[PDB]
Short mmCIF file of C-alpha atoms in Angstrom, two decimals:
data_model
loop_
_atom_site.label_atom_id
_atom_site.label_comp_id
_atom_site.label_asym_id
_atom_site.label_seq_id
_atom_site.Cartn_x
_atom_site.Cartn_y
_atom_site.Cartn_z
CA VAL A 1 51.58 22.59 -21.24
CA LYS A 2 48.73 22.32 -18.72
CA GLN A 3 46.33 19.38 -18.42
CA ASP A 4 43.86 19.99 -15.60
CA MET A 5 40.11 19.33 -15.73
CA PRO A 6 38.34 22.50 -16.90
CA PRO A 7 34.79 22.82 -18.21
CA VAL A 8 35.09 22.21 -21.94
CA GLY A 9 33.96 25.56 -23.38
CA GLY A 10 31.18 25.93 -20.81
CA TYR A 11 28.70 23.14 -20.21
CA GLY A 12 25.12 23.03 -21.35
CA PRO A 13 22.16 23.99 -19.20
CA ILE A 14 21.03 22.07 -16.13
CA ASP A 15 17.38 21.61 -15.22
CA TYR A 16 16.22 21.98 -11.62
CA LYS A 17 12.55 22.97 -11.76
CA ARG A 18 9.52 21.11 -10.37
CA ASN A 19 6.97 19.43 -12.63
CA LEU A 20 3.54 17.83 -12.09
CA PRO A 21 1.20 16.72 -14.90
CA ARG A 22 -2.01 17.60 -12.94
CA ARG A 23 -3.88 14.78 -14.70
CA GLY A 24 -6.63 15.26 -14.08
CA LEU A 25 -9.87 14.17 -15.81
CA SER A 26 -11.89 17.17 -14.39
CA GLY A 27 -13.10 15.08 -11.47
CA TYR A 28 -16.76 16.12 -11.57
CA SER A 29 -16.85 14.26 -14.87
CA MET A 30 -15.17 11.38 -13.03
CA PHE A 31 -18.09 11.38 -10.60
CA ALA A 32 -20.29 11.23 -13.69
CA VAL A 33 -18.24 8.21 -14.84
CA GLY A 34 -18.75 6.48 -11.49
CA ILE A 35 -22.48 7.21 -11.35
CA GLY A 36 -22.85 6.06 -14.96
CA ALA A 37 -21.15 2.74 -14.26
CA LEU A 38 -23.26 2.42 -11.10
CA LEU A 39 -26.55 2.96 -12.92
CA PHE A 40 -25.40 0.70 -15.77
CA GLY A 41 -24.87 -2.09 -13.27
CA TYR A 42 -28.25 -1.42 -11.66
CA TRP A 43 -30.06 -1.59 -15.00
CA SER A 44 -28.53 -4.94 -15.94
CA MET A 45 -28.99 -6.20 -12.37
CA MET A 46 -32.70 -5.33 -12.45
CA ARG A 47 -33.13 -7.18 -15.75
CA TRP A 48 -31.37 -10.35 -14.57
CA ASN A 49 -33.18 -10.43 -11.22
CA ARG A 50 -36.60 -10.22 -12.82
CA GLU A 51 -35.81 -12.94 -15.36
CA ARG A 52 -34.50 -15.14 -12.55
CA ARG A 53 -37.72 -14.52 -10.60
CA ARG A 54 -39.57 -15.83 -13.67
CA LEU A 55 -37.52 -19.02 -13.66
CA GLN A 56 -37.87 -19.43 -9.90
CA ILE A 57 -41.66 -19.26 -10.20
CA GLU A 58 -41.31 -21.96 -12.88
CA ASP A 59 -39.52 -24.17 -10.35
CA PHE A 60 -42.32 -23.39 -7.89
CA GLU A 61 -44.82 -24.65 -10.45
CA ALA A 62 -42.71 -27.79 -10.83
CA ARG A 63 -42.88 -28.58 -7.11
CA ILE A 64 -46.59 -27.73 -6.98
CA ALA A 65 -47.65 -29.93 -9.88
CA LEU A 66 -45.46 -32.83 -8.81
CA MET A 67 -46.67 -32.88 -5.20
CA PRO A 68 -49.75 -35.20 -4.79
CA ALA B 1 7.73 3.72 3.33
CA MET B 2 10.07 1.03 2.09
CA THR B 3 10.98 1.75 -1.53
CA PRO B 4 11.83 5.51 -2.01
CA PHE B 5 14.69 4.88 0.39
CA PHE B 6 15.99 2.41 -2.16
CA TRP B 7 15.64 4.58 -5.25
CA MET B 8 17.57 7.34 -3.58
CA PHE B 9 20.15 4.95 -2.14
CA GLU B 10 20.97 3.81 -5.66
CA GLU B 11 21.58 7.49 -6.40
CA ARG B 12 23.68 7.74 -3.23
CA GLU B 13 25.69 4.72 -4.42
CA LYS B 14 26.55 6.70 -7.53
CA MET B 15 27.76 9.55 -5.35
CA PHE B 16 29.84 7.16 -3.26
CA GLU B 17 31.43 6.10 -6.55
CA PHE B 18 32.32 9.74 -7.24
CA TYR B 19 33.93 10.09 -3.80
CA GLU B 20 35.86 6.90 -4.52
CA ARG B 21 37.19 8.20 -7.83
CA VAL B 22 38.24 11.40 -6.04
CA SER B 23 39.97 9.90 -3.00
CA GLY B 24 39.62 6.14 -2.82
CA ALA B 25 37.61 5.74 0.36
CA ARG B 26 34.01 4.61 0.27
CA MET B 27 32.76 7.04 2.91
CA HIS B 28 35.43 8.41 5.23
CA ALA B 29 37.55 10.17 2.66
CA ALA B 30 39.73 12.47 4.72
CA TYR B 31 40.79 14.46 1.67
CA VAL B 32 40.47 18.02 3.04
CA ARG B 33 43.71 18.92 4.69
CA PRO B 34 44.18 22.32 6.29
CA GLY B 35 45.53 24.81 3.82
CA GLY B 36 43.58 23.93 0.71
CA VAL B 37 42.50 20.59 -0.69
CA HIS B 38 45.11 17.85 -1.16
CA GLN B 39 45.54 15.53 -4.18
CA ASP B 40 43.21 17.22 -6.63
CA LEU B 41 40.72 15.50 -8.84
CA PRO B 42 41.82 13.27 -11.73
CA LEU B 43 41.10 14.02 -15.34
CA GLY B 44 37.59 13.03 -16.35
CA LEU B 45 35.20 13.80 -13.50
CA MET B 46 33.24 17.00 -14.17
CA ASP B 47 31.33 15.46 -17.08
CA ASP B 48 30.23 12.68 -14.75
CA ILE B 49 28.94 15.19 -12.21
CA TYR B 50 27.09 16.95 -15.06
CA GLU B 51 25.42 13.68 -16.12
CA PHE B 52 24.48 12.98 -12.51
CA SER B 53 22.97 16.46 -12.22
#
């Protein structure tokens, strides 16, 4: 009998092809994401700065009334 | 470019293992005499090359 190493009935298929997911996000919408986060931060920043100006004028009134 | 070197050297270590199972040497397997190939491959190797593919 003969006992070499053949392919056992023909092997299954072998992949070789390239693949890229191209993800993605449709980058103009990603610019919209960035500009939205930017303007979100500016809105909250504006609110906090004006409330802190209010409190800083209160500390001004403290130093004014305490002074004489 | 440190790391892709290392991913593909682990793959090359697998192929050094295949050369070792064929001949015995790590790298400098002589193994190809004139007049055909000497000391043909042992039973149980083609499936391993298929898995590696």
